[PDB]
Design an enzyme around this catalytic site. Structure first.
Site, PDB file in Angstrom:
ATOM      1  N   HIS A 178      25.655 -16.960 -19.065  1.00 16.98           N
ATOM      2  CA  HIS A 178      25.328 -18.383 -19.066  1.00 16.98           C
ATOM      3  C   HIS A 178      24.031 -18.590 -18.325  1.00 16.98           C
ATOM      4  O   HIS A 178      23.856 -18.021 -17.244  1.00 16.98           O
ATOM      5  CB  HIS A 178      26.449 -19.215 -18.356  1.00 16.98           C
ATOM      6  CG  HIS A 178      26.159 -20.682 -18.229  1.00 16.98           C
ATOM      7  ND1 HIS A 178      25.919 -21.493 -19.314  1.00 16.98           N
ATOM      8  CD2 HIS A 178      26.108 -21.490 -17.133  1.00 16.98           C
ATOM      9  CE1 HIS A 178      25.737 -22.738 -18.903  1.00 16.98           C
ATOM     10  NE2 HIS A 178      25.848 -22.758 -17.584  1.00 16.98           N
ATOM     11  N   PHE A 179      23.174 -19.441 -18.892  1.00 15.93           N
ATOM     12  CA  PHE A 179      21.912 -19.834 -18.245  1.00 15.93           C
ATOM     13  C   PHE A 179      22.263 -21.161 -17.559  1.00 15.93           C
ATOM     14  O   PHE A 179      22.537 -22.183 -18.217  1.00 15.93           O
ATOM     15  CB  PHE A 179      20.838 -20.092 -19.269  1.00 15.93           C
ATOM     16  CG  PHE A 179      19.485 -20.227 -18.658  1.00 15.93           C
ATOM     17  CD1 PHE A 179      19.042 -21.470 -18.217  1.00 15.93           C
ATOM     18  CD2 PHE A 179      18.709 -19.118 -18.448  1.00 15.93           C
ATOM     19  CE1 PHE A 179      17.830 -21.610 -17.556  1.00 15.93           C
ATOM     20  CE2 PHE A 179      17.438 -19.243 -17.754  1.00 15.93           C
ATOM     21  CZ  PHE A 179      17.027 -20.483 -17.321  1.00 15.93           C
ATOM     22  N   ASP A 180      22.276 -21.171 -16.244  1.00 15.65           N
ATOM     23  CA  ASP A 180      22.685 -22.374 -15.552  1.00 15.65           C
ATOM     24  C   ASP A 180      21.545 -23.314 -15.218  1.00 15.65           C
ATOM     25  O   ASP A 180      21.739 -24.525 -15.258  1.00 15.65           O
ATOM     26  CB  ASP A 180      23.388 -22.014 -14.254  1.00 15.65           C
ATOM     27  CG  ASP A 180      24.376 -23.075 -13.791  1.00 15.65           C
ATOM     28  OD1 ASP A 180      25.057 -23.677 -14.625  1.00 15.65           O
ATOM     29  OD2 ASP A 180      24.475 -23.306 -12.578  1.00 15.65           O
TER      30      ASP A 180
ATOM     31  N   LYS B 295      20.843 -28.162 -30.760  1.00 17.19           N
ATOM     32  CA  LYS B 295      21.155 -27.924 -29.347  1.00 17.19           C
ATOM     33  C   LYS B 295      20.080 -28.789 -28.643  1.00 17.19           C
ATOM     34  O   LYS B 295      18.892 -28.725 -28.962  1.00 17.19           O
ATOM     35  CB  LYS B 295      21.085 -26.450 -29.041  1.00 17.19           C
ATOM     36  CG  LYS B 295      21.567 -26.095 -27.655  1.00 17.19           C
ATOM     37  CD  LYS B 295      21.519 -24.578 -27.440  1.00 17.19           C
ATOM     38  CE  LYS B 295      22.396 -24.181 -26.272  1.00 17.19           C
ATOM     39  NZ  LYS B 295      21.711 -24.540 -25.051  1.00 17.19           N
TER      40      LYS B 295
ATOM     41  N   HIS C 261     -17.592 -29.874 -24.074  1.00 18.01           N
ATOM     42  CA  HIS C 261     -16.588 -30.025 -23.045  1.00 18.01           C
ATOM     43  C   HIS C 261     -15.288 -30.802 -23.296  1.00 18.01           C
ATOM     44  O   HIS C 261     -14.406 -30.750 -22.444  1.00 18.01           O
ATOM     45  CB  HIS C 261     -17.292 -30.576 -21.778  1.00 18.01           C
ATOM     46  CG  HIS C 261     -18.517 -29.782 -21.387  1.00 18.01           C
ATOM     47  ND1 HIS C 261     -18.439 -28.538 -20.795  1.00 18.01           N
ATOM     48  CD2 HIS C 261     -19.844 -30.061 -21.502  1.00 18.01           C
ATOM     49  CE1 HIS C 261     -19.670 -28.081 -20.565  1.00 18.01           C
ATOM     50  NE2 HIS C 261     -20.541 -28.989 -20.979  1.00 18.01           N
TER      51      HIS C 261
END
Lengths: 124, 124
Positions: free
Chosen positions: A119-121, A41, A12
């Site tokens: 664009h990824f906001d 980034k 477990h």
């Protein structure tokens, strides 16, 4: 020889290993998509739904972008996504990231013809 | 020259590729923890908290064991866990399991000295 206590542990215990645990997915994708070329980034989000489903978001829920613009759209459904964040050891040119899976509504900025994301906001 | 649309696809699109291993997690763990050697163990739970937090449960909430014994205890806090159950198409020796993550209060039977977990009884 295997004690009752050790048997419980074998059957477990799997500490720090939920199927959710981080992995080197971000390290591999961040590098192979050229996102660590001149800098690590800091944060990036990858979307695992089809491109058709993501493009469709541009004609779904209209909302304000973080920068105040109003060409952003939030997906009506939650989407499968992966957040990539730099780890404590990350330092250009040796970037390193923690991978976190998720299912959220995405918000993207859209423009052009066809009207598609540029664009990824954010995710919510 | 990379168009904004292509750049969005390069930084954020990875269709069908979520890194989640929760489809095969249970089969892998059931196999390597030796729970499929003689028969496909029907149900099994893995706990992702530290062994220290799991051993402390023996100091927590006493509750009845499924079999009626009195030496079972329930964690006050929920714990990160993964339940594995045989699928419909599982048939020894080709065992097959569905992985199901959850956050639940675990219940263990404790015994001995030290008083430690010896059986995983149920979860909240």
């Amino acid at each position: 020889k295997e004690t009752a206590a050790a048997k419980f542990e074998r059957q477990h215990m799997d500490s720090g290993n939920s199927p959710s645990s981080s992995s080197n997915y971000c390290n591999q994708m961040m590098c192979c998509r050229n996102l660590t070329k001149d800098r690590c980034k800091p944060v990036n989000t990858f979307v695992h739904e089809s491109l058709a489903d993501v493009q469709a978001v541009c004609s779904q829920k209209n909302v304000a972008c973080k920068n105040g613009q109003t060409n952003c759209y939030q997906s009506y459904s939650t989407m499968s996504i992966t957040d990539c964040r730099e780890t404590g050891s990350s330092k250009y040119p040796n970037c390193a990231y923690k991978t976190t899976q998720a299912n959220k509504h995405i918000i993207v900025a859209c423009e052009g013809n066809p009207y598609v994301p540029v664009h990824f906001d954010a995710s919510v």
